[PDB]
Amino acid sequence: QYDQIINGYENYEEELEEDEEQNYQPFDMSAERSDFESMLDDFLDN
Amino acid sequence: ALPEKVIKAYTTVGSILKTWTHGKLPKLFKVIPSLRNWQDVIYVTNPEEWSPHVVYEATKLFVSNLTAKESQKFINLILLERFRDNIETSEDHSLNYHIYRAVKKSLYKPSAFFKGFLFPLVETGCNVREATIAGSVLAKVSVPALHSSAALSYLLRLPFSPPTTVFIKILLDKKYALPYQTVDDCVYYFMRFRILDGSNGEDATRVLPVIWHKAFLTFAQRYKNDITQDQRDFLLETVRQRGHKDIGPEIRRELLAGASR
């Protein structure tokens, strides 16, 4: 309850650090939705 | 670096967003929350030049479609900065009502708001006008007692400042039920401004604004029945040493009307 959440607040900066350390990926086009480039194309053609 | 098709496409949507006021957001903009690297792409749209309309709609869009951790980053990197920038550079130091409503909407994910907006703000030179505007949002929007309490505890443990005290008072005024540990933190907070005849820090003699006294009074009215007799005595002593001409007697009165837990 309160036990859980207060610890997440007190160390919010640390948890952001740890989340980025774990889940950061550089940009990769083949790692995003496969219709992405196709959407980029329809748009650059107005 | 990003594919140049990305840069070229999102540089243009960026220009659309400078003047957008209504209708549907560009489709390419609306797919950004569906992307893993939304942070990399978003920057190309040049968020600080978005119209205030777009700030609002983007806040709705991003806060309700990102995870809390991800929402928190959006709130912090984009919303907070816009909030501060606009208040500092406006002629009457007011906030554009679109941005204002964006901040209200962001409170819908209270944890992402406190970690992404409030805590960074009070810990990075929040001024009184900033606390007054952001504080009025916090006053108006309902927040879960649990998150409200946890944020109150966090603010009470911070070094004193008048803007922080503004938020402390706002969260007290919610008059929600408090976990006994937050009640305790409140007692410890007001306690720490008394004079101990040996070791004292600045808090014992610093000048206290009226807002500190209204917060003390608020805590006394709502929570007089949730403190121990020992705690009541520390606070009555606090009021004796540090009390205010008009508010001090009211606080004392409320503290003496309370029954011990």
Residue numbers in the entry:
A (entry chain C): 360 to 405
B (entry chain A): 205 to 401, 403 to 466
Quote from the publication:
The EM densities were docked with the available crystal structures of yeast 40S ribosome and AFs or homology models of AFs. The 3' major domain RNA is directly bound by Enp1, Emg1, Utp30 and Imp4. Enp1 adopts a superhelix structure and contacts helices 32 and 33. The 3' basal subdomain makes up part of the front face, whereas the 3' beak subdomain sticks out to form the nose. The structural role of helix 44 and six assigned late factors (Utp30, Enp1, Bms1, Rcl1, Pno1, Utp20) in the 90S structure provide insight into the last major assembly event. They function to assemble the 3' major domain (Utp30, Enp1), the 3' minor domain (Pno1) and the 5' basal subdomain (Bms1) and to establish long range connections between ribosomal subdomains (helix 44, Bms1/Rcl1, Utp20).
The 5' region of pre-rRNA that consists of the 5' external transcribed spacer (5' ETS), 18S rRNA and the internal transcribed spacer 1 (ITS1) is co-transcriptionally packed into a terminal ball of ~40 nm in size. These particles represent the earliest assembly intermediates of 40S and are known as the 90S pre-ribosome or the SSU processome. Within 90S, the pre-rRNA is cleaved at sites A0 and A1 in the 5' ETS and site A2 in the ITS1, yielding a 20S pre-rRNA intermediate. The fully assembled 90S contains an unprocessed pre-18S rRNA, U3 snoRNA, approximately 51 assembly factors and 18 r-proteins with a molecular mass of 5.0 megadaltons.
